[PDB]
Ligand binder design. Sequence first.
Ligand code: HEM
Length: 152
Amino acid sequence: AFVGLSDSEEKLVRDAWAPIHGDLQGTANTVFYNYLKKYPSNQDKFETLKGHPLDEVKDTANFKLIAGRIFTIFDNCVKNVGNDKGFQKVIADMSGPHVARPITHGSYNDLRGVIYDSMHLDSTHGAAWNKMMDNFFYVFYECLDGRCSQFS
Ligand code: HEM
């Protein structure tokens, strides 16, 4: 279920994200690359990337757009980490385009893990980050299951 964060935890989440917030596109590019390199079955899910070598698409406009859009959603979630309706709406709106897509929970969680690993958080910041991400994927997975309206 969705579990609100305390004020101190909300601050911890902003602080944890601050390095990435200050280099959002560059971080996105590296993390998305590392995700597709470690879990290459996912590259085919992106029709604009399908059928080319990863190293051949990594430097392209389309690649960078996709990485950017993922990280902009997380950036807006962090922005709304103190506003549960706002946070839920950011996710609800991005969920629609994924509902029909054949993407496993495993694939989504593999991305979460690449992001976690890149951030190298201490356990206090990590605990707060994981409270936010647990909210993120509870809202997302409810929406993928056609129960998005509960957050409206
Ligand atoms: C859980 C973090 C994720 C976020 C925040 C996110 C966000 C977004 C956003 C903002 C878009 C653009 C609007 C649209 O959907 O067309 C997009 C599209 C898309 N996403 Fe995600 N996404 C996530 C995970 C994934 C994963 C793990 C996959 C595949 C393994 C995936 C596959 C897609 C596909 C295939 C599209 C359209 C691709 C194209 O332009 O070729 N998404 N996503």
